[PDB]
Amino acid sequence: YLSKIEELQLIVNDKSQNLRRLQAQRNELNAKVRLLREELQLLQEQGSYVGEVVRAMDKKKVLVKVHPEGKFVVDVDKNIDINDV
Amino acid sequence: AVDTAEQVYISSLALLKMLKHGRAGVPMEVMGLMLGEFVDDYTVRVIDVFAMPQSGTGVSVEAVDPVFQAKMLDMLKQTGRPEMVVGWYHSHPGFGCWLSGVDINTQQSFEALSERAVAVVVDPIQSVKGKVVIDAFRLINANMMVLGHEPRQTTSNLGHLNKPSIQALIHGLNRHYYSITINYRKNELEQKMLLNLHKKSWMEGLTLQDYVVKEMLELAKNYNKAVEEEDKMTPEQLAIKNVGKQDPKRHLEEHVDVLMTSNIVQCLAAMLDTVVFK
Amino acid sequence: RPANHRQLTFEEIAKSAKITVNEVELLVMKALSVGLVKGSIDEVDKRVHMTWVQPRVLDLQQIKGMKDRLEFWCTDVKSMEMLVEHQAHDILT
Amino acid sequence: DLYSRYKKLQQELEFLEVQEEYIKDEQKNLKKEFLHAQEEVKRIQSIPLVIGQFLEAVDQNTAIVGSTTGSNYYVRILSTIDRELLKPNASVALHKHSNALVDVLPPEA
Amino acid sequence: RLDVFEKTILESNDVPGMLAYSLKLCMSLMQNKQFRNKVLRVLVKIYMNLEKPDFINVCQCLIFLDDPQAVSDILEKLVKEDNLLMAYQICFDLYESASQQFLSSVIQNLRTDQTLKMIKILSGEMAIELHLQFLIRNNNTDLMILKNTKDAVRNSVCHTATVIANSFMHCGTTSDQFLRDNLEWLARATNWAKFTATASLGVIHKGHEKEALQLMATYLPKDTSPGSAYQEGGGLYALGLIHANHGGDIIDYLLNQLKNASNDIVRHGGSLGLGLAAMGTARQDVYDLLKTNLYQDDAVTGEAAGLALGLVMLGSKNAQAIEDMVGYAQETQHEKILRGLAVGIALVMYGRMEEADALIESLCRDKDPILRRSGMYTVAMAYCGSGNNKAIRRLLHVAVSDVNDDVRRAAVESLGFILFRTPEQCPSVVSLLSESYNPHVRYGAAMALGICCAGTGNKEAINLLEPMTNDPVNYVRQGALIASALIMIQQTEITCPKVNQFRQLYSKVINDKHDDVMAKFGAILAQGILDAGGHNVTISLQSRTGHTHMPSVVGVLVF
Amino acid sequence: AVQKVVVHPLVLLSVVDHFNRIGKVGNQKRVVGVLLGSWQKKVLDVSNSFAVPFDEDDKDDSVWFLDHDYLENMYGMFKKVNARERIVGWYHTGPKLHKNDIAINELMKRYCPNSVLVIIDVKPKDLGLPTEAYISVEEVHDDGTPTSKTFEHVTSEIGAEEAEEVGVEHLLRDIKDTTVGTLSQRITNQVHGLKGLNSKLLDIRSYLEKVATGKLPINHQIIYQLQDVFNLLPDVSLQEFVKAFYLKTNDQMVVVYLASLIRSVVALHNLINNKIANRDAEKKEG
Ligand SMILES: [Zn+2]
């Protein structure tokens, strides 16, 4: 029972895991604050403008008539529908 | 008869002459030739990128002066190294660094004679530090659709070259073009001395200069009051009696740190006379 | 004398300079015209104050024994540099 | 088991001693890289500011601006400007190349 | 101190097996090599002092105390006492869990009916060929997945992980099925699919030792005849695959094939094969000709030189392999040659546990992330388990504080080697590692989950990898793929309910054609490792005998 | 009367690759080259240079080699690439000088208003500054000999012009802007204290070797007339800044009043809103 108090009493010192739980959570927080601000090269290509659709037609095409411009028929992306037009 | 993922161990002077050639290279596009040595199949090196006269007429294949080639290599032969050309550079300093309609001829016009003749696109007139602005490609041709367009041998070099894959007409130009890999050499033979002069010079030269001190503190403390009253216009806005404010909208900062390091500077400046004197 | 009391009294001046009290003022205003020493001479105590001067030509024995100022400076500003850095040692960081 | 019940306690204890030392140092480095991230936000612009005006916002921090270039555009806008400062067609600042909001100026003309 | 120790091993009556599990428990709290060998050699002698002799003590002290003469003494007791049936522990643990260098030294010390079964246990071919019999008799294929992954073959992993799949299923089936079913899918061969289309015969023919040459009768080194030497070099590499750790003359015959006046066209695969063959045997001739392979100044065979020379000099502490391979490291003009030499000079010092500190500090002293990466591989092999903090402090410093992610990647591969013993705390530290900001180290954290928690029954690792395949980086999604294949070895659906989820889900994400083939690059390989054996076989990084199994460690870290 | 220039180390990387030439051509150990540029003001900027194939005899050290195949027609090249960046000087390594430097300067002085021998640093381990300039001087003596021409220390720096950090600050990958007062100041304390006081050890090298084994510039005219400036305050006991100690109370006035007041506002800054965020997190985590 001599040394048989000391390891369990050093387990009493394990609020270091909780104060560092806040610290590791803050690591995650501000590290992905950083990584979230790192996304902003997405800014650096595309001022992808508002489009002017009269109506769509078949064969996976639409009618976009751009804002001071004319009729330009194109294909669609994958995350919106011909139904969504 | 076989294709491997190549690599370009650059001399930094290549990109240095490209940045001079683009900075001073007034946004009219211009043309030159690249000078390295074809070391092996899976790597190439560029040891040199030389200069051109002011060919302000148009980028074309005719703009290469062969007597300038002869005298250039001759003046490299009376200097120490008689190396070999590896290809050609050019500059696209205005637009978004993608293959012009003359390049689509002169690339294969040059690599009809040379082996690889890798194009180099530059735009240092983008912005100042954080873009990586260099662009190189390897012309694949319609002769080589016999076997597949997949060297692949060492992977993740073309996988991290594939990681951007982003220019409009160039990812349109997956056809005719697969890029080449550009790493920057273990340059400690120069990075050593660039670091050493960089930090032995970019702090007060002989570094006994600042060791201005106090009227800048007068103006700075008047800053540090004139903005502190609007700093304290925030805890009144923290009195929302119960809760009437969406998230903290935090303006604690930017006046901790300025006060902190500025008056660290002032207290170590108060040190500085008791330091220099004894 | 390297030492202080650089607000010297006029007494050594009027003794060894063969000058009088009414002429120490001319003795140093003519030196203001000369321009090698520009003292802020006291005139409530009549003290001839020492400011910056043009020192000598050669003191070869003090070119050798300037160590008590030069090496003094070197090792003592070095030691006190080591002491400032040694008290702020482990914020090397 | 008085032979290894109490001595295996140190075994998985040394390791989180070392991680307890470690996460401190990782926080010591991420402040550096946070400063690098924040300064590298501002290397591209805010000397060369072009002028459009706001039109409408679709969603969170992404909106529509017409411009003094003639046409209209739909742009991802930063969290820098406060979310209500864009009610009229106010004098706003965009990018030459890549067209995104940096700042908004309320008066003009 | 051995005074109360000696009075309490010559003590009075309890179960003497207190001391038997106390062997492993003393080994569990062991810190040094100083009274480890002391207690290790005196408990076996207090079992020789107690009247009942023991065999688990020599089963442990042969692999921790490395005495080739005491096993010769009690093997004369195996010839004299004559009971082969109690002899199984010492005999086939000496076959099972012994170092090959210690195997050669112990068959040297031992030879001075069991008169020939003393040689037959050391060759130990009986378990090899009935293991091979198991590998031909048992099977459970999924060929529909092989076709729906065969749709995306290139000069890529599909051409290699189809044969990796049904060859980790069948290490030596001695039967053609992918040779038989097609030739045009086999006709997408360009230098690495050529190297693979001739090396895959020995891939699918692990073991089956005698019929190597007469099964590659077609693949003798004049019997291929394309215009390309890789279609004939990978075949001699496949001879090197078969002739692993038990050669005879064919080690020297691949050596002579390299020395039949042939430069870097046979060596293309045959040098890899030769180094794989004479692995750890510490030969001289292969070092003699790999010195001119080292000084080829061509890394297509030079990396084979560095790798194969590290292989033949496993844990050497040579005064000339270490120095004369670190010498060529600096003045070379490439660094994939330094990858070759990197893993070579890592493998040249294995498990020394206090010796290699001069080399680790000398190489992490330098500035090169490739050479510091070499140092991290070398500290992964010098240190495995011995978390004395002499590893982990500066190892963790350079692991996660450094500026280049490749040495960081090798360091998080080192973590899985120094953390094999108690994988309980390993979720609590590698889930923390997960939080990384960078692609290679995201992937390396996934690899730490993989090679660290290979045999575990963890579900938190799967819970980690699921957002790691919900990640825009494609190859950290393949890190989730391959690492989850390494968490789904050895275990079935009753172990964790994400097994069949990922089994059908990897085909489900290979249904998506618009993913990167880098995102599904090792998806065919995740299916193959997902049935490594068909859950028949498992990894052996730390054997159940008590001692680590070093060629498996070689396999995974060069893998 | 020249203070400082602006230095692009790009053609110093040309010094680096000519330092690669000389390691593998032959007997020429030191890097000697020619420094192009343009006088703009007392401040100046350099954009290009070149490196002569140079030899120098160890016997009768005034043996130069500056080829006009390498000067005139390469000058035509460098004139064809730009008319602006013409000659301004030359460069050689070491810190000191060799003998022939004066004549190598006077060779290309015929082309330039002031040719400069910036002595360059290829293996930087120095205690003071990097590469440094020397202007044409006529100081001769107070004795009146034929006119002196040994080009005197008329200094320089390493200035930074403009952008180039597309290359440079991407090529950093290591360094950080210290928010000054964050051991940047003690980097400076180390460098300026230690490197100015072993510069003072160079001064005691002067003031010991020029006392034991050193003649004619022993007290040249600028040793004693600057021992004046050394005799600003060298004094013996504690040097008695009697004015300056209550004047240093007047100094410490501003500093520690900003410490007390301002750092008490810093106490308010961290502590009050830290208690807000802290205790809200604490019990509103329930
Ligand atoms: Zn161009």
Side-chain angles (χ1 to χ4, degrees), chain E residues 271-304:
Chain E
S271 54
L272 291 86
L274 179 64
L276 182 62
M279 183 188 69
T281 57
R283 303 287 290 163
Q284 180 62 257
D285 297 331
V286 64
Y287 177 70
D288 292 330
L289 67 102
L290 262 68
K291 282 185 286 188
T292 190
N293 200 4
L294 184 71
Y295 289 167
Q296 283 301 109
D297 198 0
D298 192 1
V300 66
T301 182
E303 296 172 0

mmCIF file of all heavy atoms in Angstrom, chain E residues 271-304:
data_model
loop_
_atom_site.group_PDB
_atom_site.id
_atom_site.type_symbol
_atom_site.label_atom_id
_atom_site.label_comp_id
_atom_site.label_asym_id
_atom_site.label_seq_id
_atom_site.Cartn_x
_atom_site.Cartn_y
_atom_site.Cartn_z
ATOM 1 N N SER E 271 17.372 -6.963 -59.602
ATOM 2 C CA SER E 271 18.091 -6.453 -58.445
ATOM 3 C C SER E 271 17.163 -6.312 -57.246
ATOM 4 O O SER E 271 17.542 -6.652 -56.115
ATOM 5 C CB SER E 271 18.750 -5.128 -58.813
ATOM 6 O OG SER E 271 17.784 -4.245 -59.341
ATOM 7 N N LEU E 272 15.948 -5.800 -57.490
ATOM 8 C CA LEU E 272 14.878 -5.847 -56.499
ATOM 9 C C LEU E 272 14.633 -7.273 -56.029
ATOM 10 O O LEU E 272 14.506 -7.528 -54.823
ATOM 11 C CB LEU E 272 13.576 -5.290 -57.078
ATOM 12 C CG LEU E 272 13.359 -3.817 -57.422
ATOM 13 C CD1 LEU E 272 13.857 -3.521 -58.802
ATOM 14 C CD2 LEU E 272 11.903 -3.445 -57.314
ATOM 15 N N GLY E 273 14.594 -8.214 -56.977
ATOM 16 C CA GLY E 273 14.354 -9.607 -56.635
ATOM 17 C C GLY E 273 15.473 -10.217 -55.811
ATOM 18 O O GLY E 273 15.222 -10.947 -54.852
ATOM 19 N N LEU E 274 16.724 -9.914 -56.172
ATOM 20 C CA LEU E 274 17.879 -10.445 -55.452
ATOM 21 C C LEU E 274 17.955 -9.907 -54.029
ATOM 22 O O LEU E 274 18.226 -10.663 -53.086
ATOM 23 C CB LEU E 274 19.159 -10.108 -56.214
ATOM 24 C CG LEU E 274 20.469 -10.579 -55.586
ATOM 25 C CD1 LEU E 274 20.505 -12.078 -55.533
ATOM 26 C CD2 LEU E 274 21.647 -10.044 -56.368
ATOM 27 N N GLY E 275 17.741 -8.599 -53.859
ATOM 28 C CA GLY E 275 17.717 -8.032 -52.520
ATOM 29 C C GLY E 275 16.573 -8.559 -51.680
ATOM 30 O O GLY E 275 16.722 -8.784 -50.477
ATOM 31 N N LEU E 276 15.403 -8.737 -52.302
ATOM 32 C CA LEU E 276 14.291 -9.400 -51.636
ATOM 33 C C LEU E 276 14.627 -10.837 -51.259
ATOM 34 O O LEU E 276 14.180 -11.328 -50.216
ATOM 35 C CB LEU E 276 13.067 -9.359 -52.546
ATOM 36 C CG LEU E 276 11.764 -9.961 -52.034
ATOM 37 C CD1 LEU E 276 11.282 -9.228 -50.795
ATOM 38 C CD2 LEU E 276 10.732 -9.898 -53.130
ATOM 39 N N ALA E 277 15.431 -11.513 -52.079
ATOM 40 C CA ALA E 277 15.742 -12.915 -51.835
ATOM 41 C C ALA E 277 16.728 -13.076 -50.686
ATOM 42 O O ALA E 277 16.425 -13.739 -49.687
ATOM 43 C CB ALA E 277 16.289 -13.557 -53.110
ATOM 44 N N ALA E 278 17.905 -12.463 -50.793
ATOM 45 C CA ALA E 278 18.890 -12.553 -49.716
ATOM 46 C C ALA E 278 18.654 -11.530 -48.612
ATOM 47 O O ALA E 278 19.582 -10.836 -48.197
ATOM 48 C CB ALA E 278 20.294 -12.402 -50.299
ATOM 49 N N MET E 279 17.434 -11.453 -48.085
ATOM 50 C CA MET E 279 17.071 -10.397 -47.150
ATOM 51 C C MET E 279 17.495 -10.777 -45.740
ATOM 52 O O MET E 279 17.085 -11.822 -45.223
ATOM 53 C CB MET E 279 15.571 -10.144 -47.187
ATOM 54 C CG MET E 279 15.153 -9.013 -46.278
ATOM 55 S SD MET E 279 13.370 -8.922 -46.182
ATOM 56 C CE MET E 279 13.109 -10.426 -45.263
ATOM 57 N N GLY E 280 18.306 -9.928 -45.112
ATOM 58 C CA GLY E 280 18.751 -10.164 -43.756
ATOM 59 C C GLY E 280 19.831 -11.210 -43.596
ATOM 60 O O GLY E 280 20.348 -11.376 -42.485
ATOM 61 N N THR E 281 20.188 -11.927 -44.663
ATOM 62 C CA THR E 281 21.212 -12.960 -44.604
ATOM 63 C C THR E 281 22.618 -12.398 -44.454
ATOM 64 O O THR E 281 23.529 -13.172 -44.134
ATOM 65 C CB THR E 281 21.135 -13.827 -45.860
ATOM 66 O OG1 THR E 281 21.279 -12.994 -47.015
ATOM 67 C CG2 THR E 281 19.800 -14.545 -45.933
ATOM 68 N N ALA E 282 22.792 -11.089 -44.660
ATOM 69 C CA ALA E 282 24.061 -10.361 -44.555
ATOM 70 C C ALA E 282 25.147 -10.993 -45.431
ATOM 71 O O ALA E 282 26.182 -11.465 -44.964
ATOM 72 C CB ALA E 282 24.515 -10.254 -43.094
ATOM 73 N N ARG E 283 24.869 -10.984 -46.729
ATOM 74 C CA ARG E 283 25.814 -11.529 -47.685
ATOM 75 C C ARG E 283 26.920 -10.518 -47.971
ATOM 76 O O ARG E 283 26.905 -9.376 -47.504
ATOM 77 C CB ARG E 283 25.110 -11.905 -48.984
ATOM 78 C CG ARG E 283 23.972 -12.886 -48.841
ATOM 79 C CD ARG E 283 24.458 -14.287 -48.547
ATOM 80 N NE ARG E 283 25.129 -14.874 -49.701
ATOM 81 C CZ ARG E 283 25.922 -15.939 -49.645
ATOM 82 N NH1 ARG E 283 26.154 -16.537 -48.485
ATOM 83 N NH2 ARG E 283 26.487 -16.403 -50.751
ATOM 84 N N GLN E 284 27.896 -10.964 -48.754
ATOM 85 C CA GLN E 284 29.017 -10.144 -49.189
ATOM 86 C C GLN E 284 28.963 -9.828 -50.675
ATOM 87 O O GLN E 284 29.177 -8.678 -51.066
ATOM 88 C CB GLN E 284 30.338 -10.851 -48.853
ATOM 89 C CG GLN E 284 31.577 -10.080 -49.259
ATOM 90 C CD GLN E 284 31.683 -8.749 -48.553
ATOM 91 O OE1 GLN E 284 31.407 -7.701 -49.134
ATOM 92 N NE2 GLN E 284 32.087 -8.782 -47.291
ATOM 93 N N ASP E 285 28.667 -10.835 -51.504
ATOM 94 C CA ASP E 285 28.721 -10.686 -52.958
ATOM 95 C C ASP E 285 27.666 -9.712 -53.463
ATOM 96 O O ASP E 285 27.923 -8.927 -54.388
ATOM 97 C CB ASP E 285 28.529 -12.048 -53.620
ATOM 98 C CG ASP E 285 29.624 -13.028 -53.270
ATOM 99 O OD1 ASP E 285 30.765 -12.591 -53.012
ATOM 100 O OD2 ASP E 285 29.337 -14.243 -53.252
ATOM 101 N N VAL E 286 26.468 -9.758 -52.872
ATOM 102 C CA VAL E 286 25.406 -8.843 -53.272
ATOM 103 C C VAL E 286 25.762 -7.416 -52.866
ATOM 104 O O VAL E 286 25.456 -6.469 -53.591
ATOM 105 C CB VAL E 286 24.043 -9.305 -52.710
ATOM 106 C CG1 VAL E 286 23.994 -9.277 -51.196
ATOM 107 C CG2 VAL E 286 22.909 -8.468 -53.270
ATOM 108 N N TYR E 287 26.485 -7.245 -51.753
ATOM 109 C CA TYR E 287 27.005 -5.925 -51.427
ATOM 110 C C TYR E 287 28.091 -5.499 -52.401
ATOM 111 O O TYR E 287 28.154 -4.323 -52.774
ATOM 112 C CB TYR E 287 27.534 -5.899 -49.999
ATOM 113 C CG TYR E 287 28.145 -4.574 -49.622
ATOM 114 C CD1 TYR E 287 27.355 -3.451 -49.454
ATOM 115 C CD2 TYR E 287 29.510 -4.452 -49.418
ATOM 116 C CE1 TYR E 287 27.896 -2.236 -49.108
ATOM 117 C CE2 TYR E 287 30.064 -3.242 -49.059
ATOM 118 C CZ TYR E 287 29.253 -2.135 -48.914
ATOM 119 O OH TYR E 287 29.807 -0.925 -48.564
ATOM 120 N N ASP E 288 28.892 -6.456 -52.879
ATOM 121 C CA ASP E 288 30.002 -6.148 -53.779
ATOM 122 C C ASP E 288 29.505 -5.667 -55.136
ATOM 123 O O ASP E 288 30.059 -4.720 -55.706
ATOM 124 C CB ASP E 288 30.891 -7.379 -53.952
ATOM 125 C CG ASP E 288 31.637 -7.739 -52.687
ATOM 126 O OD1 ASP E 288 31.944 -6.822 -51.896
ATOM 127 O OD2 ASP E 288 31.903 -8.941 -52.474
ATOM 128 N N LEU E 289 28.466 -6.306 -55.665
ATOM 129 C CA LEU E 289 27.906 -5.880 -56.943
ATOM 130 C C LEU E 289 26.845 -4.797 -56.789
ATOM 131 O O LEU E 289 26.617 -4.015 -57.721
ATOM 132 C CB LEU E 289 27.354 -7.095 -57.689
ATOM 133 C CG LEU E 289 26.141 -7.853 -57.156
ATOM 134 C CD1 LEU E 289 24.902 -7.483 -57.922
ATOM 135 C CD2 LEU E 289 26.359 -9.327 -57.222
ATOM 136 N N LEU E 290 26.227 -4.678 -55.620
ATOM 137 C CA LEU E 290 25.399 -3.512 -55.400
ATOM 138 C C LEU E 290 26.204 -2.269 -55.077
ATOM 139 O O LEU E 290 25.622 -1.191 -55.058
ATOM 140 C CB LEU E 290 24.367 -3.781 -54.311
ATOM 141 C CG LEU E 290 22.989 -4.170 -54.858
ATOM 142 C CD1 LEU E 290 22.943 -5.505 -55.538
ATOM 143 C CD2 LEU E 290 21.984 -4.162 -53.740
ATOM 144 N N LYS E 291 27.517 -2.367 -54.876
ATOM 145 C CA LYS E 291 28.292 -1.131 -54.855
ATOM 146 C C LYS E 291 28.428 -0.519 -56.249
ATOM 147 O O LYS E 291 28.303 0.702 -56.401
ATOM 148 C CB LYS E 291 29.660 -1.365 -54.218
ATOM 149 C CG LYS E 291 29.598 -1.437 -52.699
ATOM 150 C CD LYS E 291 30.973 -1.556 -52.078
ATOM 151 C CE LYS E 291 31.542 -2.949 -52.276
ATOM 152 N NZ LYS E 291 32.801 -3.147 -51.503
ATOM 153 N N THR E 292 28.625 -1.331 -57.291
ATOM 154 C CA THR E 292 28.583 -0.730 -58.619
ATOM 155 C C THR E 292 27.155 -0.479 -59.082
ATOM 156 O O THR E 292 26.942 0.391 -59.936
ATOM 157 C CB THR E 292 29.347 -1.567 -59.654
ATOM 158 O OG1 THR E 292 29.461 -0.809 -60.864
ATOM 159 C CG2 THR E 292 28.645 -2.868 -59.977
ATOM 160 N N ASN E 293 26.170 -1.181 -58.514
ATOM 161 C CA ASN E 293 24.790 -0.775 -58.745
ATOM 162 C C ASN E 293 24.493 0.559 -58.058
ATOM 163 O O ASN E 293 23.711 1.373 -58.566
ATOM 164 C CB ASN E 293 23.829 -1.858 -58.270
ATOM 165 C CG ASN E 293 22.457 -1.737 -58.902
ATOM 166 O OD1 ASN E 293 22.229 -0.880 -59.756
ATOM 167 N ND2 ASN E 293 21.525 -2.577 -58.464
ATOM 168 N N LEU E 294 25.105 0.788 -56.893
ATOM 169 C CA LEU E 294 24.999 2.049 -56.171
ATOM 170 C C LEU E 294 25.643 3.176 -56.959
ATOM 171 O O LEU E 294 25.134 4.303 -56.987
ATOM 172 C CB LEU E 294 25.686 1.905 -54.810
ATOM 173 C CG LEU E 294 25.683 3.016 -53.762
ATOM 174 C CD1 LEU E 294 24.300 3.165 -53.166
ATOM 175 C CD2 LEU E 294 26.718 2.744 -52.680
ATOM 176 N N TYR E 295 26.764 2.883 -57.609
ATOM 177 C CA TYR E 295 27.488 3.875 -58.383
ATOM 178 C C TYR E 295 27.169 3.793 -59.871
ATOM 179 O O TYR E 295 27.962 4.270 -60.690
ATOM 180 C CB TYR E 295 28.993 3.740 -58.138
ATOM 181 C CG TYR E 295 29.445 4.175 -56.753
ATOM 182 C CD1 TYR E 295 30.724 3.874 -56.290
ATOM 183 C CD2 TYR E 295 28.603 4.900 -55.917
ATOM 184 C CE1 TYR E 295 31.139 4.274 -55.030
ATOM 185 C CE2 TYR E 295 29.010 5.293 -54.664
ATOM 186 C CZ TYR E 295 30.272 4.986 -54.228
ATOM 187 O OH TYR E 295 30.647 5.400 -52.974
ATOM 188 N N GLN E 296 26.042 3.168 -60.235
ATOM 189 C CA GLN E 296 25.479 3.277 -61.581
ATOM 190 C C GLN E 296 25.280 4.708 -62.057
ATOM 191 O O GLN E 296 25.428 4.976 -63.255
ATOM 192 C CB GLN E 296 24.129 2.566 -61.688
ATOM 193 C CG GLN E 296 24.206 1.072 -61.780
ATOM 194 C CD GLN E 296 25.001 0.602 -62.967
ATOM 195 O OE1 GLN E 296 26.107 0.086 -62.814
ATOM 196 N NE2 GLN E 296 24.450 0.776 -64.162
ATOM 197 N N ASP E 297 24.918 5.606 -61.128
ATOM 198 C CA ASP E 297 24.441 6.963 -61.422
ATOM 199 C C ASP E 297 23.226 6.901 -62.351
ATOM 200 O O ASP E 297 23.119 7.636 -63.335
ATOM 201 C CB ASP E 297 25.556 7.857 -61.987
ATOM 202 C CG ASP E 297 25.235 9.341 -61.897
ATOM 203 O OD1 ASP E 297 24.150 9.700 -61.394
ATOM 204 O OD2 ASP E 297 26.076 10.151 -62.338
ATOM 205 N N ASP E 298 22.313 5.985 -62.038
ATOM 206 C CA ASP E 298 21.027 5.876 -62.721
ATOM 207 C C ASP E 298 20.061 5.271 -61.718
ATOM 208 O O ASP E 298 20.209 4.102 -61.346
ATOM 209 C CB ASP E 298 21.129 5.009 -63.980
ATOM 210 C CG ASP E 298 19.895 5.106 -64.864
ATOM 211 O OD1 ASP E 298 18.961 5.861 -64.522
ATOM 212 O OD2 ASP E 298 19.856 4.418 -65.906
ATOM 213 N N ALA E 299 19.078 6.055 -61.284
ATOM 214 C CA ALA E 299 18.271 5.643 -60.146
ATOM 215 C C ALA E 299 17.205 4.619 -60.499
ATOM 216 O O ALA E 299 16.608 4.052 -59.583
ATOM 217 C CB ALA E 299 17.622 6.858 -59.483
ATOM 218 N N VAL E 300 16.959 4.355 -61.788
ATOM 219 C CA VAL E 300 16.004 3.312 -62.160
ATOM 220 C C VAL E 300 16.508 1.939 -61.720
ATOM 221 O O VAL E 300 15.715 1.043 -61.405
ATOM 222 C CB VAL E 300 15.697 3.383 -63.675
ATOM 223 C CG1 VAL E 300 16.921 3.055 -64.529
ATOM 224 C CG2 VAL E 300 14.505 2.502 -64.042
ATOM 225 N N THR E 301 17.825 1.768 -61.643
ATOM 226 C CA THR E 301 18.430 0.655 -60.933
ATOM 227 C C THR E 301 19.111 1.078 -59.640
ATOM 228 O O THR E 301 19.385 0.229 -58.793
ATOM 229 C CB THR E 301 19.436 -0.069 -61.838
ATOM 230 O OG1 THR E 301 19.997 -1.190 -61.143
ATOM 231 C CG2 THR E 301 20.536 0.875 -62.293
ATOM 232 N N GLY E 302 19.380 2.374 -59.465
ATOM 233 C CA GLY E 302 20.019 2.830 -58.242
ATOM 234 C C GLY E 302 19.124 2.768 -57.019
ATOM 235 O O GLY E 302 19.598 2.516 -55.909
ATOM 236 N N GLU E 303 17.828 3.030 -57.190
ATOM 237 C CA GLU E 303 16.906 2.876 -56.075
ATOM 238 C C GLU E 303 16.749 1.418 -55.715
ATOM 239 O O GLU E 303 16.617 1.081 -54.536
ATOM 240 C CB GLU E 303 15.542 3.443 -56.429
ATOM 241 C CG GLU E 303 15.530 4.915 -56.672
ATOM 242 C CD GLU E 303 14.199 5.361 -57.204
ATOM 243 O OE1 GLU E 303 13.305 4.508 -57.384
ATOM 244 O OE2 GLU E 303 14.059 6.553 -57.496
ATOM 245 N N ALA E 304 16.772 0.557 -56.728
ATOM 246 C CA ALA E 304 16.843 -0.876 -56.500
ATOM 247 C C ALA E 304 18.106 -1.255 -55.739
ATOM 248 O O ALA E 304 18.070 -2.132 -54.873
ATOM 249 C CB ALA E 304 16.784 -1.593 -57.836
#
